Amino acid sequence: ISEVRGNTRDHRTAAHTHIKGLGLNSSGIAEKQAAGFVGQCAAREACGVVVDLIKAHKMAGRGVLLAGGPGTGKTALALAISQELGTKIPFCPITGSEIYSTEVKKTEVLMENFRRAIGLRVRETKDVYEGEVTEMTPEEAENPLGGYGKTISTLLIGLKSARGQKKLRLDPSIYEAIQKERVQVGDVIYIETNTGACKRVGRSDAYATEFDLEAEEYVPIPKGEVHKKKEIVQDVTLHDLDVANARPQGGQDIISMMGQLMKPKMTEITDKLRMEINKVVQKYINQGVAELIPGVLFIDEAHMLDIECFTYLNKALESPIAPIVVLASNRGIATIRGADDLKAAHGIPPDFLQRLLIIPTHPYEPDEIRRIVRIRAQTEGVQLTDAAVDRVAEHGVRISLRYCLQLLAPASILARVNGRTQVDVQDIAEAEELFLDARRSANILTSTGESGGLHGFIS
Amino acid sequence: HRTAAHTHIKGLGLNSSGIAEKQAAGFVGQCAAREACGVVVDLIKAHKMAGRGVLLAGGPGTGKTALALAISQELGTKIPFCPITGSEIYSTEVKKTEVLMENFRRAIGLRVRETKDVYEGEVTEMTPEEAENPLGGYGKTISTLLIGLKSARGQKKLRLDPSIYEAIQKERVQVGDVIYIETNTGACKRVGRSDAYATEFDLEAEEYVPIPKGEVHKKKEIVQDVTLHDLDVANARPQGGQDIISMMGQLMKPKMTEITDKLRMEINKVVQKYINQGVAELIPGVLFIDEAHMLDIECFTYLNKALESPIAPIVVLASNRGIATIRGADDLKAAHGIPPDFLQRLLIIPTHPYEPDEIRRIVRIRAQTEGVQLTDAAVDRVAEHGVRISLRYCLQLLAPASILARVNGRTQVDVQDIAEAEELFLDARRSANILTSTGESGGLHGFIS
Amino acid sequence: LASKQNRLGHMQIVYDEPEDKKWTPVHALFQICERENPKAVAEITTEGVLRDLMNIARVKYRELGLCRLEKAARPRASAPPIEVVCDSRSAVIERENIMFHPAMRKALFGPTPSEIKEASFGPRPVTLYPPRALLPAPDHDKQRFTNITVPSMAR
Amino acid sequence: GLNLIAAHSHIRGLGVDADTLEPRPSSQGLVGQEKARKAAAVVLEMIKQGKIAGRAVLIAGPPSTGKTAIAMGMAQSLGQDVPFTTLAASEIFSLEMSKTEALTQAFRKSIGVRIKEESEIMEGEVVEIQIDRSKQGKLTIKTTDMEAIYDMGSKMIDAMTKERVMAGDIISIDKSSGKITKLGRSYARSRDYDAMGVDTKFLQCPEGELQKRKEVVHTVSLHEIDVINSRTQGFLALFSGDTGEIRSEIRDQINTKVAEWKEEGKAEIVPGVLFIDEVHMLDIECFSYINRALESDLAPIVIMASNRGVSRIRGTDYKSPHGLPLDFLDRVVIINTHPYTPDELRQILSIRAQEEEVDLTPDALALLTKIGQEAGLRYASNLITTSQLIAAKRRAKQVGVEDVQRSFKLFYDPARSVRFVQESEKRLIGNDGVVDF
Amino acid sequence: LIAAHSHIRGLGVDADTLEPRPSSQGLVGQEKARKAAAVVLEMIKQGKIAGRAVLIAGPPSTGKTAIAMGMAQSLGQDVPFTTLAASEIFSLEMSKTEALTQAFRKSIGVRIKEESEIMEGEVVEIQIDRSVTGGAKQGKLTIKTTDMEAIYDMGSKMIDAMTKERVMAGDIISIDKSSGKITKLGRSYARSRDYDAMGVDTKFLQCPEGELQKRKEVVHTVSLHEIDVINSRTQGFLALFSGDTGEIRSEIRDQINTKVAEWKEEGKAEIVPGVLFIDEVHMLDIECFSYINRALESDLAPIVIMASNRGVSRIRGTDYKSPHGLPLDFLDRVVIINTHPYTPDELRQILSIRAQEEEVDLTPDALALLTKIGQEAGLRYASNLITTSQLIAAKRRAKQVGVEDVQRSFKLFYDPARSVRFVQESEKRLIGNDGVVDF
Ligand SMILES: Nc1ncnc2c1ncn2[C@@H]1O[C@H](COP(=O)(O)OP(=O)(O)O)[C@@H](O)[C@H]1O
Ligand SMILES: Nc1ncnc2c1ncn2[C@@H]1O[C@H](COP(=O)(O)OP(=O)(O)O)[C@@H](O)[C@H]1O
Ligand SMILES: Nc1ncnc2c1ncn2[C@@H]1O[C@H](COP(=O)(O)OP(=O)(O)O)[C@@H](O)[C@H]1O
Ligand SMILES: Nc1ncnc2c1ncn2[C@@H]1O[C@H](COP(=O)(O)OP(=O)(O)O)[C@@H](O)[C@H]1O
């Protein structure tokens, strides 16, 4: 049905597209201009130690702070850690202004994000009979029961997959499936092994024209095996276990068929449930079935959490099953949001700050901004001459780092509109007056915007 | 068998002429408060009360709530007594005036005779008889039954509505189950398989009971103790009967709602109809609001109209505050936190501090109440701590000093055990002194200021 | 919803091949959360090591004996809902069509045994408007949906 | 016909040259704001390219200068292909969902998923239901041109039974799913019955071939996919509004499957434009989330407007330029605007005249230009309607100097209302006391 | 795994004299507070005295939560121990006072004892009668041990459990008659060679001997909060897990208290009083203290142990200061135990315990440098340096950690004493309460 378009399968350029990893040695010493970064040596070495702590499974409730001013690379190090760990270890990048809800208390969304940050890998088996039914032929028993009519000892089913067919003898108590589910000749089913009750998936596609109008889903033949003995790795976060134990998904009554029919409400979870789930996960680890994998809860903008949240974070980090908490703060002496009394460093209370491995982040040298400009330019594909690179680096040193990385898109647009392929000095000198920074905007705002009048701003 | 903070109090200890005799029935001294509390108790037990204000002033640690437990043990079991606090009424479902009125109608009781009409039988033949059901979507509908109940003396063969059949059907009554159809609501609780079908080879773990003796149509009277708030909740969220509002209303989660003025007047007229039939007896009670200064001005506004009612229990307020600021509006200061308009309703009872011998008597009573025997020098030491530090600090130095006595093989508590427990366990004043002295500067070994 | 057989869970059981490129029907394309669900894969596994996590609340609720325990509290008063005393015939008909409303009662308790007989002796399979009894199972075995208790041979 | 002449009605697109990006002055309604319109044209040309994800473009300037006019010009000059979202900032402060989620849904609305397919539907009017009680049956359907007889086997006879299809209905069958959708009855059977029911609506007969197949281009948003997968019958929630804090795991599964559809060639992702009007109403608890949601691959090119000068930030107590925190202004780019010369004011009033089909004498236009220079645009544009109406009361075709002076005499501009307030302070309730004469 | 309180294995005092040992069971280096907590533990294990208040005051990073976990490990899994933090109470679902009332009533265990009836033996035949398209079920189960041969009947729930378990002929099952669970223990025959979808060959067990109907006396411990939730709602059970309990009225609690007293007198139940630990109580406002002071007035109140950090702080929801942030009408009721900052000869052995717990081997020069760092930055920086130096020594392939690894970790990760200076140096590229510049 759906028509496939044969176009180019490209991707989009975000602000952290060029980051591809930390770019370390085999000894941990960082190396400049590698895998996207430029400079920032000690922070990348410390983040490599953090990555090693996460992959070594010795972290059990640590905490890492990322200090440093705005526009210096904290979120860049966070995405570098998330791409260095891979995909099979969880990573939940919430912000500080995402714990404030209107259905639950704000010291609960934190705990649900902890449970989102922890993964659980389960290795199991799957034994199913599979495919389209060809025959449903019974077999009369050797000794019929007196007082009844038919007496059937073994029910035969011919299952035909897309590779090979097979006759199957079954216990006769598959009949209660077949009458209740209405399985006929030409309907793909699967028969499990632990119980053995077949459930119809649908009418096959080969019988999609015996009738004309009587239509349902016409699923194809299962293009695979007829006897799957396939093993499955399965990743479930503990948040998913908390939700599936708290609010059950599929029930058979009226009120649970109104619960999934009405809106799902976040509800607070009692601590006995979490204690029980931890006590049973730590038992299935000791049996040697499930692996616990801790992840990263990168709480960006950690100065938006007020003082009522760090108190809950102390309890939550003292739990025996907890991920790492990579905070990200870019404030100096700040007033904590909850208690408007104490002016503390970073917006973090002094009691909570002792738990944190504080990693600094330094400003950039005036000969590294141009290397970041070269990497960002060859990331987007926008090519440009060297004098243009020097002018963008001049704007980068004198104004901002995030502003010299945003004079590349309008310069490229004006370049390929003017009739060229590469960006020269003229296109950036023209695009620097169509897109003012914050500094010249505040200069126009104060100088020209004298006071509130007719042709004036509203202070 | 747990010694709480208030265990030795067994009453006010009053004479026949209403004169408080000191050191009697738990209290020590405190004459002018216990005589006034005896007057309040006999004001409760005379039923000429439709809202009177009794304030219990006095500083903390002087026994304001000891008088309240004395009143609650002097009234008796069959008189309602609702103790709350000032922080309990700030709810999240309803406005706090609703919680005030729910406590006011918790504090009024009613003693009602009822005549239940049970049909207590053993089910013999259960056969439905459906009626006509034309094309209307839902299909057939059972409309009539023929359940035969079989008691010990005289069976009966009765016919049922659809709703009482659904009451049966949501109980899973087979043939043989003894039941008891309650023909007031319509409810019918299965009791068990009758012993005529008894078999030790069983698996359902059923409860086998014999055939109920007597007539199958019994009729029995009981006495019930119901407050008016129970009637308010009963008529507000219905959970009786066999219709749909009263069945889908007990599967939902229960929520406190705002029982309005009209229901609170109609239930008053229904209760007056009960009293005029010579069945029910009204017994008003006490609302003890401890820590009344936590109530804000939006509550003292509503207590005026709540006490102007023709039926309203007596209020006993406790407030350990001096000149303080009312919680609601922060620009008028008053005594006790009570606003200066609401304070005129109150019959204010003072409470005075103690003496260095009354502390000795309270320490002796508390020691012989908990079960800790000790010597007189130790009693003098604890009374010295009671004079210097606090009253309810020196009472709490008896529970470690017993345990420490049992460390050293002793039975009675001597001077050494209290001299050690005064060093292990500290009060608030010396802890604040250590706090101010040691916590000089914030840093590594400092305190978060 | 009570008479709709779910099938998009089962697609994850059958159509589970890397060659099969995660086939979904186009008329059910946007129901993504209906399609990839770990519960459906969980209910198939040989060892129930995930089925013993998905409903551990019921197992802990049963193993604490919170069903067999005698019900300690009960409400002190009960009542029928308030009705309207309006003296027309239409008011009585509207009461017996709203406060009772036999469609919901039929949908809740189940089918008439006459309807069971005409649906189970017919020549062809036919559906039922309450396809099963939609009353929820009560979560307290000794005292279900009432308040009427009795002394306990225990005491 | 639910379309009346508002303030933003003459702006039919941005009105710049599409080749060399030269803002000619009087084109497509907009007049003489050449540098800001050039910058908006550069922004629009990097929107339609759709590669560069998650910029932020602030439009500062004084009031009554054209900040929402340029936004509506960018909205008109995209078409129905690329989405656009007009969200004023006070919409976010809700009481059912928090600020973070109600601002995430603003980003989830402005990214479309585009998918092209073939719809195998069958219209038709039922003529005769023929059921063979032997299972089989025959359905006779007609249109204005054709008539056919199709076989039926077992179960859609039961679907007809559950739908209660009589002879004369207009049924429609989606043969890729197989479910009968009764559209109503025909006008050829309105003569039959006399007292109709409630549910019956009459329709014309279907026209043309029975089997209609057509290639249709569906375009949904990511917010549609998020809300449909929220609960079971949750598709009506996006019309109703009965949704709340959607979990992050659902949005994660949905972004993974949209990436998978882009890999398999089923879907094409079309990034759009989020327009946050009057961004100074957001508090710091919202900018701390905007600074992170502009980082993902699935983020629209946000265009925001602002009025205020050095003002306080709501939620905190420190002044800042444009009412925005400086860690957010290090991230955005700013296009300043400028007030208007009288030569532009005259032709803007001429365009507002020809939009409202009101004829003006040149002396009235010069007087109205002087009034607009002395009071502003929003008062001068509100005098064209009043002068037309006063001319309609005295039955004159062309408005004149007399009608504009009458409209200036009756209604007050905001420049004189302040002198009216400060002239009589003893009667207006200032903060404490009223005299009441 | 290895959390921050996994080395602690109790409180570490004597049983006859309760003298504080200077080095015993993890909690090493403090004597006064551990002896006082031993006295509190002994009067909790007595269970008689109800409604006290213990306030573990002292500077941060001095082992207050360590003493709390030492009492938690010393009571075992018998007595309830609620680890409540003070910020959890501020809900939006329920009121602020009712969350405290639930937090008190979660810490009073009720220990009841009931008789169940368990079966045992080999299933000989199953007989299930089923209707067509909805209807009841009938069941006959023939089971045989080595002695008895019984033919039991079944109801609907037993068949719904049998078909869920797939109990075939020749299984060793054990049915609890009261609760109604089925646990297959194994088989006595082998797997048949006639059917395909049979299953997995289970453990080979023989036929059990003895009797069929055996009795068992099990012990079930529920908190009072679970009794409140199961007796407050008609059908809405399981809301004691998913936290959906809105409000429990006082008519329910005043009946459940009386019934628990009656169960106490009848010998049915036994009340085990417990511990409510409140971590960092200084976050609670005065509206909480005006209820906490009066909930400690009844026979069903737990012995509250709670921590604090603050000096003269202002109480939240008010306008004035007080020691520890607690009001002086509430500080009369409490009893304050002080803790002292540590000495370096104690920090040495604490870091030695923390190093031996995380399986890290050291050199004495590195331990001396580590103690020198821990003198100036507390334990909370030193333990992180231990783990970090372990992994840096693992990166450069060294057996034991050294001075160079500790210096590397000290160079990379700042202690807060240097991050404060890092804030105070560059104040122009950090957002204070004002603007910021960019180079
Ligand atoms: N070391 C680096 N190498 C390359 N680009 C960098 C580096 N550090 C920062 N950037 C760029 O600077 C931009 C802004 O940095 P950002 O991560 O926003 O700072 P912060 O983490 O303080 O918010 C990002 O787009 C990132 O691409
Ligand atoms: N007259 C008294 N006799 C014995 N004990 C008393 C007396 N007055 C006060 N107390 C003791 O004081 C303690 C606290 O009294 P309480 O009423 O709680 O003080 P407050 O009035 O501040 O509430 C109680 O444990 C009680 O034993
Ligand atoms: N260049 C222009 N040409 C024509 N009309 C304009 C122009 N600029 C603004 N306008 C008109 O002026 C009015 C005010 O613009 P608007 O953006 O609403 O001001 P503000 O930014 O104060 O909200 C709009 O109704 C618009 O129709
Ligand atoms: N006396 C001690 N014995 C063992 N470990 C201790 C001791 N004192 C502190 N610690 C360790 O130091 C850390 C801080 O103790 P903790 O009680 O969390 O401090 P705080 O009371 O400030 O929260 C804990 O992880 C604990 O392992």
TrEMBL record, chain B:
Reactions catalysed according to its record: ATP + H2O = ADP + phosphate + H(+)
User: What is its EC class?
Assistant: hydrolase
What residue ranges are annotated as transmembrane?
Answer: none
Residue numbers binding ATP: A5, H6, V28, G61, T62, G63, K64, T65, A66, Y354, R366, R392
Which SMART domains does the record cross-reference, listed alphabetically? AAA (SM00382)
List, in alphabetical order, the Gene Ontology terms for molecular function in this entry.
ATP binding; ATP hydrolysis activity; DNA helicase activity
- Spell out the GO cellular component terms annotated for this protein, sorted alphabetically and separated by semicolons: Ino80 complex; Swr1 complex
Binding of ADP occurs at A5, H6, H8, V28, P60, G61, T62, G63, K64, T65, A66, Y354, R392
Main localization of the protein?
nucleus
Query: Alphabetically, which GO biological process terms does the record hold?
Result: chromatin organization; DNA repair
Q: Which InterPro entries match?
A: AAA+_ATPase (IPR003593), P-loop_NTPase (IPR027417), RuvB-like (IPR027238), RuvB-like_C (IPR041048), RuvBL1/2_DNA/RNA_bd_dom (IPR042487), TIP49_P-loop (IPR010339)
The protein in question is named RuvB-like helicase
Organism the protein comes from? Chaetomium thermophilum (strain DSM 1495 / CBS 144.50 / IMI 039719)
Taxonomic lineage? Eukaryota, Fungi, Dikarya, Ascomycota, Pezizomycotina
UniProtKB/TrEMBL annotation, chain E:
Q: Where does ADP 4 bind?
A: R294, R333
Query: What are the record keywords, sorted?
Result: Activator, ATP-binding, Chromatin regulator, DNA damage, DNA repair, Helicase, Hydrolase, Nucleotide-binding, Nucleus, Transcription, Transcription regulation
What's the protein called, per UniProt?
RuvB-like helicase
- The residues listed in the UniProt record as binding ADP 3, with positions renumbered to this chain, are R294
UniProt xrefs under Pfam families: TIP49, TIP49_C
What's this protein's family per the entry? Belongs to the RuvB family.
What positions does the domain AAA+ ATPase occupy? 50-328
